[PDB]
Amino acid sequence: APMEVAVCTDSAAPMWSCIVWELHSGANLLTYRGGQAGPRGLALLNGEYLLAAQLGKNYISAWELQRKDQLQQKIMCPGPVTCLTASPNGLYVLAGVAESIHLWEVSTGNLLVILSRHYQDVSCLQFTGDSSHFISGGKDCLVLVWSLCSVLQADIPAPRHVWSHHALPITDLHCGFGGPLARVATSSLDQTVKLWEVSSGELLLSVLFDVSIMAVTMDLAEHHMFCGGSEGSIFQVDLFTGKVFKGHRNQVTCLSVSTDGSVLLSGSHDETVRLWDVQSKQCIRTVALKGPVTNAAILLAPVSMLSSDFRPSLPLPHFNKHLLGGLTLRLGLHQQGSEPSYLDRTEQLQAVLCSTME
Amino acid sequence: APMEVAVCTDSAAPMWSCIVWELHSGANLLTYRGGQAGPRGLALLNGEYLLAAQLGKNYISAWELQRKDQLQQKIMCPGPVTCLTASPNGLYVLAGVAESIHLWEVSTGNLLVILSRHYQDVSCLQFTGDSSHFISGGKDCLVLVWSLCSVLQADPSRIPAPRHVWSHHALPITDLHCGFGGPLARVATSSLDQTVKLWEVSSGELLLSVLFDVSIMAVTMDLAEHHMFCGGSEGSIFQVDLFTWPGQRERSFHPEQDAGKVFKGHRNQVTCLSVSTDGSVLLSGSHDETVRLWDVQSKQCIRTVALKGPVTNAAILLAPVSMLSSDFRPSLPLPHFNKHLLGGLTLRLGLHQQGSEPSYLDRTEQLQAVLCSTME
Amino acid sequence: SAPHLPGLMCLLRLHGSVGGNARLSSIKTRFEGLCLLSLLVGESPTELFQQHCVSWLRSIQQVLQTQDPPATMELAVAVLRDLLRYAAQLPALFRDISMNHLPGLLTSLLGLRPECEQSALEGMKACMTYFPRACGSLKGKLASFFLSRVDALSPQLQQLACECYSRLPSLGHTESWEQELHSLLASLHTLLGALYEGAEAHVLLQLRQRFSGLARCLGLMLSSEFGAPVSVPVQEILDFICRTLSVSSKNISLHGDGPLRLLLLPSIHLEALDLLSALILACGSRLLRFGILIGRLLPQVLNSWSIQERPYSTVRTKVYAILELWVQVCGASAGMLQGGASGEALLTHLLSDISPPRKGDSNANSDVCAAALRGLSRTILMCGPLIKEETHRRLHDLVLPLVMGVQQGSSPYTSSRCRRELYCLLLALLLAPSPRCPPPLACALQAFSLGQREDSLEVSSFCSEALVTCAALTHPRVPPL
Amino acid sequence: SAPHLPGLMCLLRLHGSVSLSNARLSSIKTRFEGLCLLSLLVGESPTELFQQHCVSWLRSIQQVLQTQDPPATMELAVAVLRDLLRYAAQLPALFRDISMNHLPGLLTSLLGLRPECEQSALEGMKACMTYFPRACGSLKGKLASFFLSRVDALSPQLQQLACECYSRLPSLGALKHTESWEQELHSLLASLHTLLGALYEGAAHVLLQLRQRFSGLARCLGLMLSSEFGAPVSVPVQEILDFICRTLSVSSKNISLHGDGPLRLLLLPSIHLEALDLLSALILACGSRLLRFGILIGRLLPQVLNSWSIGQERPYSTVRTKVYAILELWVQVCGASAGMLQGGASGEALLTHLLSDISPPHRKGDSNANSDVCAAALRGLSRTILMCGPLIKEETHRRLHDLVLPLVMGVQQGGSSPYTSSRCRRELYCLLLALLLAPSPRCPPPLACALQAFSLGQREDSLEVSSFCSEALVTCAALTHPRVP
Amino acid sequence: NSIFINWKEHANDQQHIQVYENGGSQPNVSSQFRLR
């Protein structure tokens, strides 16, 4: 059976700043020591490096996956960075400095573009499962859908969809799988959770709750939409057809569903990360941290997290601070696995033998 | 652009017996001369032969498509032939005699099996759109789903049984419509009890039980299963919308809207329905001696072609190469269809690679390789 | 400028320049003129061809009887193939060549040195293909030539002889077809009696070659073109195939010539399987009546040949290709893997070949693990909902933990073709599920998402083309009736 | 029993069952039998036998390689030696012993072959350079001199082998590898620029040598970009793209018609093919990081297809097939962010070149006319519609519907057309399925006619089409029979 | 073509959700292609 971990950080950080434990064990696999990870500001890059924006500061620390120590790379930003994300393929790193988005690059290290179109602070970014549309929701009730094509190839870039229906700041969103076929699920403090469409850009659902929603997450099959709350409740919306997860006592900030849509992981403000089994709304584990939870997401364990001697293939470049070929890459990866099979090192040998005999 | 025809037959046959006229022009294409047809008794075989049953008599005629005169071959059965249907691929011709389901084979001409489970006559016979299952129903209020695999390779001492036994109606069946697919298709059986039920051929479960006001005598469905045009015993052609789906399993027509979902203009029963390819013109026969085309999008008539006598068979096809061409001598002659129960396949080889010829660049590269090898 | 000729010929052909007798008369510049001749025959307008076809044919015939080195003869034959193929379409030229030129070409081709057997057969196949009626004069000599070379040890020579000999009943048809086929199936019924004398030195090594040639000829006869309907004796062929696949290693004696016969055993079973493939390819979907025998044959052959690459890695791949072909031709009527001891045995054999198990190899057993998956995916996708829920549930517990383990040594999944087939089998399981066993969409979407972030351009492309299809099972368009 | 030896060896290999071998290696008449026995043993031997006899077998092969035997014996010996040196790199003791004792002498023995048997020398040299790259580092100068002189050989096999063996030089030797790789790449680029300037003086036997040198060096660069390397590199994308854009700049309307003008006009397609091959290698190597340089790649296709445009096969088919293959590769490596056919002037001058290649148009010719472009174009269009589908305007989707739907139902029920091959029909049905799967959300696809079109395919005569069409009705049975609302 | 739902109504069995790929609360499946 595949190994599943649950990355969980905090905001006080007495000793560590990241505790990756096992889902069905509770045992701590890896612990990283350093600063304090800010809200919505953790994203593993390329499966070897772990970036984490600091709480209220202007720099982003970078930890190796198999070293309990901060690296000397200290990516710097010209302002109070807010939230961070990394593209799923592991090629770009996106920041949230003030009311502007900073786009970086991993293979070289340059700073390609500084987007600025929201009217108040940027609150959350996310990539649409295949790094083709990064969608940022600010604190001015706007949710914009950028395109990774038209943003990179520019001379000023413009968003592809200015979704303006909320009457209060946006808090969280969850982009689905696929490219221009996914379904974004935004949520704000106006007590509403909306499910948009990326292909056309039209509203599809406007489920309205009774408390300020602060977190939304759908399972991979889009059969449920576990919207959080501000009173502790973790609601559940059935998109295919006793639906309230109860047991919290504060805002529910971080939510994430396991692979086979059967285990929830709630991260609240009361220093607690639970583990609900979503078929009967019962709690399983109640791991308690030492401060309000900042990031908590269920993650499939990569290969680097299982080998005790793993080292990154490439070093992290010196991330630039000012605006702008020379790609740095390891060759011979597009053919990894393509080898002449057993019945091809024999057919060639037999043809050689036959030709020699004749 | 493709060409759509509308095969029509009359139960009186003063001069012609199967007139084929163009859909959007109304002009005749092919006519045929011979005995009267029979209800649910027409089936094109392999797009070359126009087999037809006979009203009352017990035998089946055979017209070559590009020939106005009857052939000298007559399939004979030990009892009054009721319905006929040729498999879509063209390998098997299957007919129903009284209560039996006599099954033939076009290639060799043998009579493989004689299945027999209905308790009374068989009045409808259809083949699933991939010729893997064939659904049979009769005047015993039973609709059975056979399987072409189990009823062919069964032991002579195994008496093959139907895969599914659908018994929910309380009156004789009248028509069926098996959609595209195979082990995933859907049937639309309709009976005389004023119901039209849509079954599933994969698991064998009911899905819909629309209950009308008058007895239903013909059901056809859009190829994508968007509409279910159910005929009536008074003239109306009711229309059900499967994509609106109010959300229940036993609906009723009057709560499902009226006067805006009913084709009207007929004065007697409608024992014929068929929807065109794109789904914008519907052809319907009747018993008031009229075959008229509708305008499903706007529920209006277009033309009112009038036959002589009651209309037995009427359908819309996609005109093959046979009807467009002028000679088209058939590839293989129709064999001697046996009437007694039983290697030797008769077929033309070299058809599994039709068109798999080397491309220009392939031949050029081979020639250049030969030249280079000769140079060395 | 002799060596640069082929490049110039190719570049002149590419521009489409020509399509819009002097240098051939000397031994020094035969190639120099043959190149231009190849261009002219390849890319000529209809007027120039209709004018100079006879002259070019006479020149080509003249090259074949001048004791030139074999390369020149092969080039002349290559030119002659195109010449005859293009001249077979024009009616007047067709009649003229068929009347007063073809017998000379056949006589010159037959009378060649024993050092140039390949080119002679290559030209005679072209002569017999596009000009069938006019070669009936020399049918006896052609039969003798194609029959004396049908057991040559060189694989290319044997293949050419078998290809040329399979169309003998075509020159002159239905009566000549079955008459020949009842003699090949009679000779094969005799060699098997002198090769399997335990259940049914150098003489055996020739009998095996004769059997291979006479089986390849029948296989080519069954699955080629023809201009007249024929009556295929399916029962006799199936009886012969079942007899061939009946003797296993446990019946061959081990005292005397036994080791030699046992060493030759897999080749004859492979020949029988090739005959079965030809039969399935030719008859089509009319074999449902013998489907029971056909579906019983495969598990028995797999069982009699089952035991670092594993031994007997060619027979099992052939059987899996046979199963894939059988499911492909029939469709939903195949009746594979659904009920019966034979079906259960086939499922067990398929499930023990895709599961992954110092001098050695990385991708050990990487051909069997691909054919088994390529057969299983097709079988599940075509005849899906008719399989009992237990088989689908057994496959759900194997594929899902496996597609998430190959992306996190001596394993067959270190290849790329052995992973694309797995990702196709996952989609086949999703698309056609049993009515009472819902598929694991949530656990398969994650695997597909992980697939498109891979490195191989084959896996990372199929796992991205499969997400679009999977987005139709999650984002529907009409209500679920 | 000499003629029967290959069959006996193959049959012994089939069963996996595994003095006489070395006894027959000391003569001329029985060399082939001993080589066959060695080929069986050295490939299907247990670990202990190999670890005990590797040195003896290598010494025997080295003895064989210097006896002036006919080239077939050298071919067989090198074929055995490739396996011998591939299997000797997985045993540390044997690896060290060979690399420290025998490889320097074996390299000289390989170098000492006669000019007639040069291909076997190149094959053995590739074998000793791919698996054993560190010991073969004291003779790099001789290796470079040997491989450089054969980079312009007219024989395609010899040229390809020399190019394959010449792009492995940077890996040879002992941070140093990256510097050597970069230096070799820059030197090759400079030489390519000089040769390109030599061949394009505008805008009779020296041109045919300059073209060979240019093709050889461009293929060496292409194999250098798309091979396996140990240390990370710093591939310069801008310089390579500038060179490609320069090569694809000179068209047939600028070459002078006087002097040697016809010669420079005849060699143009080969140079353009070399540039396109280099671009394809670049796209294959870099991957999806070329999105920033996306405009150049999206514009070079309707510009190359504009300088090579016209029962007769159309002129310039190879170039218009290569461009479509490059488009398919681009879309397949990029994904939904390929940005092809999505508006602009260069995105509508390409769709015209696509609709003019997939449409169908007593005399000579062939039935399958233009059957190469009509398959590559269909594959590229199907991939583009499948990936970048919900982003294309409604007009393109409607035009594609009106051009495809009445074409799949006329080819079935209805001489000398591109749609007479079992490939141009399967690709057309693939395009139909792609259009159904990813439609623009303002023009619903015709799900009622496509199902009928597929229903006419599963009962066709072929097997490829009759399998794909019957496999598309299982996918199409999910667009009309859903399981959730 | 959007659906508005109160949570408390959806918590009980009053309201149900039906969202489709190309349209909200309506299939949007009728095509304008006609063979002619």
GROMACS .gro file of C-alpha atoms in nm, chain D residues 57-296:
model
  240
 1272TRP     CA    1   3.658  -1.448  -2.356
 1273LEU     CA    2   3.776  -1.088  -2.399
 1274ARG     CA    3   4.129  -1.207  -2.479
 1275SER     CA    4   3.987  -1.450  -2.736
 1276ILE     CA    5   3.783  -1.172  -2.897
 1277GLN     CA    6   4.089  -0.946  -2.908
 1278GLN     CA    7   4.285  -1.229  -3.071
 1279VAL     CA    8   4.010  -1.272  -3.331
 1280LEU     CA    9   3.993  -0.898  -3.405
 1281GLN     CA   10   4.345  -0.896  -3.557
 1282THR     CA   11   4.356  -1.191  -3.800
 1283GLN     CA   12   4.256  -1.024  -4.132
 1284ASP     CA   13   3.949  -1.247  -4.155
 1285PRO     CA   14   3.655  -1.151  -4.379
 1286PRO     CA   15   3.447  -0.862  -4.241
 1287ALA     CA   16   3.162  -1.093  -4.136
 1288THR     CA   17   3.386  -1.241  -3.866
 1289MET     CA   18   3.464  -0.890  -3.739
 1290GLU     CA   19   3.092  -0.806  -3.739
 1291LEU     CA   20   3.013  -1.112  -3.528
 1292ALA     CA   21   3.309  -1.049  -3.297
 1293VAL     CA   22   3.203  -0.689  -3.235
 1294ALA     CA   23   2.843  -0.800  -3.180
 1295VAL     CA   24   2.964  -1.040  -2.911
 1296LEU     CA   25   3.204  -0.782  -2.764
 1297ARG     CA   26   2.924  -0.528  -2.719
 1298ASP     CA   27   2.739  -0.771  -2.491
 1299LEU     CA   28   3.065  -0.874  -2.323
 1300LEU     CA   29   3.147  -0.514  -2.227
 1301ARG     CA   30   2.786  -0.430  -2.139
 1302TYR     CA   31   2.765  -0.720  -1.892
 1303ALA     CA   32   3.111  -0.647  -1.746
 1304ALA     CA   33   3.012  -0.305  -1.608
 1305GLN     CA   34   2.777  -0.449  -1.343
 1306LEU     CA   35   3.055  -0.646  -1.168
 1307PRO     CA   36   3.291  -0.413  -0.976
 1308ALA     CA   37   3.586  -0.655  -0.975
 1309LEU     CA   38   3.557  -0.737  -1.346
 1310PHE     CA   39   3.489  -0.371  -1.424
 1311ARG     CA   40   3.804  -0.255  -1.246
 1312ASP     CA   41   4.021  -0.533  -1.389
 1313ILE     CA   42   3.908  -0.473  -1.748
 1314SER     CA   43   3.926  -0.093  -1.719
 1315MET     CA   44   4.279  -0.110  -1.576
 1316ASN     CA   45   4.429  -0.386  -1.792
 1317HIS     CA   46   4.254  -0.469  -2.119
 1318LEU     CA   47   4.060  -0.165  -2.242
 1319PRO     CA   48   4.366   0.046  -2.342
 1320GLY     CA   49   4.494  -0.243  -2.555
 1321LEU     CA   50   4.150  -0.332  -2.686
 1322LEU     CA   51   4.105   0.026  -2.806
 1323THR     CA   52   4.429   0.007  -3.005
 1324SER     CA   53   4.327  -0.331  -3.148
 1325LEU     CA   54   3.995  -0.179  -3.256
 1326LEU     CA   55   4.178   0.120  -3.407
 1327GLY     CA   56   4.408  -0.109  -3.604
 1328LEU     CA   57   4.133  -0.250  -3.825
 1329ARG     CA   58   4.153  -0.229  -4.203
 1330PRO     CA   59   3.968   0.051  -4.386
 1331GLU     CA   60   3.731  -0.203  -4.544
 1332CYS     CA   61   3.584  -0.302  -4.205
 1333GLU     CA   62   3.529   0.048  -4.069
 1334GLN     CA   63   3.167   0.007  -3.956
 1335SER     CA   64   3.259  -0.270  -3.711
 1336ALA     CA   65   3.527  -0.044  -3.563
 1337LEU     CA   66   3.271   0.232  -3.505
 1338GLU     CA   67   3.024  -0.012  -3.346
 1339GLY     CA   68   3.288  -0.153  -3.113
 1340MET     CA   69   3.407   0.197  -3.029
 1341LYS     CA   70   3.054   0.298  -2.931
 1342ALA     CA   71   3.036  -0.018  -2.721
 1343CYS     CA   72   3.362   0.067  -2.538
 1344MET     CA   73   3.263   0.435  -2.499
 1345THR     CA   74   2.907   0.393  -2.367
 1346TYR     CA   75   2.965   0.146  -2.083
 1347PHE     CA   76   3.335   0.210  -2.008
 1348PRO     CA   77   3.386   0.587  -2.044
 1349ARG     CA   78   3.664   0.649  -1.790
 1350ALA     CA   79   3.937   0.408  -1.902
 1351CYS     CA   80   3.883   0.515  -2.265
 1352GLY     CA   81   4.011   0.862  -2.187
 1353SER     CA   82   4.382   0.841  -2.262
 1354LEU     CA   83   4.317   0.809  -2.638
 1355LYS     CA   84   4.067   1.093  -2.683
 1356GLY     CA   85   4.276   1.267  -2.949
 1357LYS     CA   86   4.292   0.962  -3.174
 1358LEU     CA   87   3.921   0.894  -3.117
 1359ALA     CA   88   3.835   1.252  -3.214
 1360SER     CA   89   4.056   1.237  -3.524
 1361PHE     CA   90   3.896   0.907  -3.626
 1362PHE     CA   91   3.537   1.025  -3.576
 1363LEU     CA   92   3.580   1.373  -3.726
 1364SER     CA   93   3.700   1.247  -4.064
 1365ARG     CA   94   3.394   1.021  -4.098
 1366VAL     CA   95   3.131   1.281  -4.001
 1367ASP     CA   96   3.085   1.364  -4.371
 1368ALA     CA   97   3.068   1.008  -4.506
 1369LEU     CA   98   2.811   0.967  -4.783
 1370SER     CA   99   2.689   0.628  -4.657
 1371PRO     CA  100   2.383   0.692  -4.436
 1372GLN     CA  101   2.467   0.411  -4.193
 1373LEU     CA  102   2.832   0.515  -4.165
 1374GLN     CA  103   2.735   0.882  -4.124
 1375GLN     CA  104   2.481   0.801  -3.854
 1376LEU     CA  105   2.723   0.574  -3.666
 1377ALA     CA  106   3.000   0.835  -3.680
 1378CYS     CA  107   2.762   1.106  -3.558
 1379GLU     CA  108   2.650   0.881  -3.272
 1380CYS     CA  109   3.010   0.805  -3.172
 1381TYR     CA  110   3.122   1.169  -3.212
 1382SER     CA  111   2.863   1.321  -2.976
 1383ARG     CA  112   2.992   1.107  -2.686
 1384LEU     CA  113   3.331   1.281  -2.672
 1385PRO     CA  114   3.234   1.530  -2.394
 1386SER     CA  115   3.136   1.240  -2.167
 1387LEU     CA  116   3.480   1.084  -2.223
 1388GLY     CA  117   3.757   1.167  -1.978
 1389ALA     CA  118   3.750   1.208  -1.601
 1390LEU     CA  119   3.274   2.018  -1.359
 1391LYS     CA  120   3.510   1.923  -1.642
 1392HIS     CA  121   3.234   1.737  -1.828
 1393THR     CA  122   3.000   2.037  -1.824
 1394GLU     CA  123   3.274   2.267  -1.955
 1395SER     CA  124   3.365   2.021  -2.231
 1396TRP     CA  125   2.998   1.985  -2.329
 1397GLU     CA  126   2.944   2.361  -2.347
 1398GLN     CA  127   3.266   2.420  -2.541
 1399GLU     CA  128   3.183   2.148  -2.795
 1400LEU     CA  129   2.829   2.283  -2.838
 1401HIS     CA  130   2.958   2.635  -2.901
 1402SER     CA  131   3.223   2.514  -3.147
 1403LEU     CA  132   2.961   2.315  -3.338
 1404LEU     CA  133   2.733   2.619  -3.349
 1405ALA     CA  134   3.014   2.838  -3.484
 1406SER     CA  135   3.101   2.582  -3.753
 1407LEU     CA  136   2.734   2.554  -3.849
 1408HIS     CA  137   2.712   2.933  -3.881
 1409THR     CA  138   3.021   2.942  -4.103
 1410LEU     CA  139   2.890   2.664  -4.328
 1411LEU     CA  140   2.545   2.824  -4.350
 1412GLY     CA  141   2.707   3.149  -4.457
 1413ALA     CA  142   2.906   2.957  -4.717
 1414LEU     CA  143   2.598   2.787  -4.867
 1415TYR     CA  144   2.383   3.103  -4.878
 1416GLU     CA  145   2.599   3.355  -5.065
 1417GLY     CA  146   2.281   3.473  -5.237
 1418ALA     CA  147   2.026   3.627  -4.999
 1419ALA     CA  148   2.950   2.270  -5.860
 1420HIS     CA  149   3.116   1.992  -5.660
 1421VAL     CA  150   3.221   2.191  -5.352
 1422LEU     CA  151   2.856   2.263  -5.266
 1423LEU     CA  152   2.792   1.888  -5.246
 1424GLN     CA  153   3.070   1.859  -4.986
 1425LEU     CA  154   2.968   2.167  -4.787
 1426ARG     CA  155   2.613   2.032  -4.768
 1427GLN     CA  156   2.741   1.699  -4.636
 1428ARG     CA  157   2.952   1.872  -4.370
 1429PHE     CA  158   2.658   2.092  -4.269
 1430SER     CA  159   2.423   1.794  -4.241
 1431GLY     CA  160   2.675   1.594  -4.039
 1432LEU     CA  161   2.744   1.875  -3.794
 1433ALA     CA  162   2.374   1.954  -3.752
 1434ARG     CA  163   2.298   1.588  -3.680
 1435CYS     CA  164   2.585   1.580  -3.428
 1436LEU     CA  165   2.431   1.882  -3.254
 1437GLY     CA  166   2.089   1.717  -3.260
 1438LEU     CA  167   2.225   1.400  -3.100
 1439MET     CA  168   2.419   1.609  -2.847
 1440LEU     CA  169   2.103   1.788  -2.731
 1441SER     CA  170   1.894   1.469  -2.699
 1442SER     CA  171   2.129   1.218  -2.536
 1443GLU     CA  172   2.220   1.105  -2.183
 1444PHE     CA  173   2.472   1.307  -1.982
 1445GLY     CA  174   2.597   1.283  -1.625
 1446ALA     CA  175   2.657   1.637  -1.502
 1447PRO     CA  176   2.401   1.917  -1.545
 1448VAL     CA  177   2.440   2.145  -1.846
 1449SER     CA  178   2.351   2.503  -1.948
 1450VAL     CA  179   2.180   2.457  -2.287
 1451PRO     CA  180   2.177   2.797  -2.465
 1452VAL     CA  181   1.829   2.822  -2.614
 1453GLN     CA  182   1.849   3.172  -2.762
 1454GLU     CA  183   2.152   3.098  -2.980
 1455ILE     CA  184   2.010   2.772  -3.117
 1456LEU     CA  185   1.675   2.938  -3.189
 1457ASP     CA  186   1.851   3.229  -3.362
 1458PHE     CA  187   2.041   2.984  -3.583
 1459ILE     CA  188   1.720   2.796  -3.666
 1460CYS     CA  189   1.536   3.120  -3.746
 1461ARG     CA  190   1.826   3.217  -3.972
 1462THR     CA  191   1.821   2.884  -4.156
 1463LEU     CA  192   1.444   2.899  -4.217
 1464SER     CA  193   1.468   3.258  -4.346
 1465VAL     CA  194   1.595   3.201  -4.701
 1466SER     CA  195   1.313   3.088  -4.931
 1467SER     CA  196   1.294   2.987  -5.297
 1468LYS     CA  197   1.202   3.342  -5.407
 1469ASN     CA  198   1.538   3.495  -5.307
 1470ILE     CA  199   1.791   3.258  -5.466
 1471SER     CA  200   1.947   3.402  -5.781
 1472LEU     CA  201   1.869   3.224  -6.108
 1473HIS     CA  202   2.213   3.280  -6.266
 1474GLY     CA  203   2.544   3.103  -6.224
 1475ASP     CA  204   2.511   2.819  -5.974
 1476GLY     CA  205   2.161   2.930  -5.873
 1477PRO     CA  206   1.984   2.603  -5.958
 1478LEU     CA  207   2.226   2.409  -5.737
 1479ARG     CA  208   2.159   2.636  -5.440
 1480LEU     CA  209   1.785   2.607  -5.510
 1481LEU     CA  210   1.793   2.227  -5.526
 1482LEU     CA  211   1.970   2.186  -5.190
 1483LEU     CA  212   1.724   2.410  -5.002
 1484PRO     CA  213   1.481   2.140  -4.874
 1485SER     CA  214   1.765   1.936  -4.723
 1486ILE     CA  215   1.891   2.237  -4.527
 1487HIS     CA  216   1.538   2.322  -4.411
 1488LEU     CA  217   1.490   1.960  -4.304
 1489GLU     CA  218   1.813   1.974  -4.105
 1490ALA     CA  219   1.700   2.293  -3.931
 1491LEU     CA  220   1.360   2.140  -3.852
 1492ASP     CA  221   1.531   1.830  -3.712
 1493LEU     CA  222   1.747   2.050  -3.489
 1494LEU     CA  223   1.436   2.233  -3.369
 1495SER     CA  224   1.262   1.903  -3.295
 1496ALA     CA  225   1.564   1.786  -3.095
 1497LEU     CA  226   1.561   2.115  -2.902
 1498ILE     CA  227   1.191   2.077  -2.819
 1499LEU     CA  228   1.251   1.715  -2.716
 1500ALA     CA  229   1.540   1.806  -2.486
 1501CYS     CA  230   1.427   2.129  -2.318
 1502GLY     CA  231   1.068   2.015  -2.262
 1503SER     CA  232   0.800   2.259  -2.146
 1504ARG     CA  233   1.048   2.535  -2.054
 1505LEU     CA  234   1.020   2.682  -2.406
 1506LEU     CA  235   0.689   2.853  -2.327
 1507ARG     CA  236   0.868   3.187  -2.293
 1508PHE     CA  237   1.003   3.141  -2.647
 1509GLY     CA  238   0.657   3.036  -2.763
 1510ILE     CA  239   0.592   3.306  -3.021
 1511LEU     CA  240   0.893   3.211  -3.235
   0.00000   0.00000   0.00000
